Amino acid sequence: AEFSDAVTEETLKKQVAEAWSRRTPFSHEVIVMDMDPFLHCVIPNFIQSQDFLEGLQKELMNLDFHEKYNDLYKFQQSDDLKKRREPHISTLRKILFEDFRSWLSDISKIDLESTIDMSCAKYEFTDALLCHDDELEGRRIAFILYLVPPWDRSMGGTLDLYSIDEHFQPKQIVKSLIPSWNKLVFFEVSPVSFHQVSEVLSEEKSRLSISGWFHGPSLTRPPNYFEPPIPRSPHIPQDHEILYDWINPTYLDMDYQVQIQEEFEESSEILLKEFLKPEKFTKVCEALEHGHVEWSSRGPPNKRFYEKAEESKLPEILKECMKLFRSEALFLLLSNFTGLKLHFLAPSSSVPMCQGELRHWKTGHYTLIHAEFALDLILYCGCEGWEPEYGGFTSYIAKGEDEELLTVNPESNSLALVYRDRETLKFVKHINHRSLEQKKTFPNRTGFWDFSFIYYE
Ligand SMILES: O=C(O)CNC(=O)C(=O)O
Ligand SMILES: [Mn+2]
Ligand code: NA
């Protein structure tokens, strides 16, 4: 078979070339090219023969698919396609990396390489590929060919394109493309080519595609942008005694503390169940569930998406719970738990510091991998029956590696303490639509909350 005869029609090819050259939009029955937020093009009915495409779908669906998972994505990818001998796949390689490539090279004036770079992806319920720019040395043009059944926005899996802010960081979704059978999309890989595949919501259907890159000369990426560090602050000096009113007495016993520290020093992590006194814990959950709290959304999408409480406007019990975690007394307690020097009265410049926030996590929220030693603290509220399959767990990994070192699962009134070295990173995995199963049990609840603090020696 062959890709659409109608785009190789020379008058159209030259008009497309002009539009590329001038970075100007161009619309036609068989091809649309847009420049906002960045250069992307859509070719419906990319391949003329429906029979070839059905034969292609069949071969692909008869491949073995392996699970792909990390902070950025969750989906299935095929046995690789490059050396694959099945005839429809073989033909497609040639259609893409000889015929279509020469056409693209001509209109783009980019000398694209023959290098074959293509995979087959399957996205099903809860699968998603979050905000990213495709940047990798050599990648110049991204392409995706959809081989999906009848598809609509409600089924998810949209190819979303982001606008960008002053600092070359993604701002928000300004284009959302719906996949459809035999539609090809391609776009330029650049420092601003931010995009995602939105979560697939259909529980029945499977989003099938061929995707990859045409390789070309390495462009010029600008300097790596570093966000303004979140302000840190020393402990709130002690006025009134606050620990014995808030903390489970078990954990305020000295002999239990040395045992905790013994365990903590071996693994540099611990999990303390029923950390707060239930009297307080329930008042805290009560306020979160029935009180007035002002939330704001945190970004940008290529780093994070979750809700954070406006701390100054919190109900007193939540204000006080935050003050607890900022308090001199807790700094000292954590020293006793960990053997870290977070207070001057703890055994043996430096002034210890912390940053903290009250977070709300629900469907769609996440953080991604982006150096310093630090102690992470999390206290979970309102997540009974929360399942790992929902996402929302915190995963710790070794840097420059795919190795998970630890997983923290939301559990009510459990305090997780985890020490990070400079070669250790963390993220909160994308919370997917299975989490809606929560409402079968707690109909008036949506997601869960935590107190998330970081302490520095
Ligand atoms: O499949 C899509 O619609 C978009 N794919 C990608 O951005 C990718 O695989 O890197
Ligand atoms: Mn991509
Ligand atoms: Na570490």
Author numbering: 24 to 371, 430 to 451, 456 to 542
Show me the paper's own sentences about this structure.
Following optimization of hits from high-throughput crystallization trials, diffraction quality crystals for full-length H. sapiens OGFOD1 (542 amino acids [aa], 63 kDa) and S. cerevisiae Tpa1p (644 aa, 74 kDa) in complex with Mn(II) and inhibitors were obtained (catalytically inactive Mn(II) was used as an Fe(II) surrogate). In all of the OGFOD1 and Tpa1p structures, the inhibitors ligate the metal in a bidentate manner. With OGFOD1 the C-5 carboxylate of NOG is positioned to form hydrogen bonds to the side chains of Tyr169 and Arg230 (analogous interactions occur with Tpa1p); the latter is part of a conserved RXS motif that binds to the 2OG C-5 carboxylate in a large subfamily of 2OG oxygenases (e.g. deacetoxycephalosporin C synthase) (Ser232 Oγ and NOG C-5 carboxylate oxygen distance is 4.4 Å) (Clifton et al., 2006; Aik et al., 2012). A glycerol molecule is observed in the apparent OGFOD1 substrate binding site and forms a hydrogen bond to the NOG oxalyl carboxylate (2.3 Å). The metal and NOG in the OGFOD1 active site are positioned similarly to those in the PHD2 active site.
OGFOD1 in Homo sapiens, Sud1 in Drosophila melanogaster, and Tpa1p in Saccharomyces cerevisiae were found to catalyze prolyl 3-hydroxylation of the highly conserved Pro62 and Pro64 of uS12 (RPS23) in humans and yeast, respectively (Ban et al., 2014; Katz et al., 2014; Loenarz et al., 2014; Singleton et al., 2014). We describe crystal structures of the human uS12 prolyl 3-hydroxylase (OGFOD1) and its homolog from Saccharomyces cerevisiae (Tpa1p): OGFOD1 in complex with the broad-spectrum 2OG oxygenase inhibitors; N-oxalylglycine (NOG) and pyridine-2,4-dicarboxylate (2,4-PDCA) to 2.1 and 2.6 Å resolution, respectively; and Tpa1p in complex with NOG, 2,4-PDCA, and 1-chloro-4-hydroxyisoquinoline-3-carbonylglycine (a more selective prolyl hydroxylase inhibitor) to 2.8, 1.9, and 1.9 Å resolution, respectively. Prior to its assignment as a uS12 P3H, crystal structures of Tpa1p revealed that it contains tandem DSBH domains, only one of which, the N-terminal domain, was predicted to harbor the catalytic machinery (Kim et al., 2009; Henri et al., 2010).
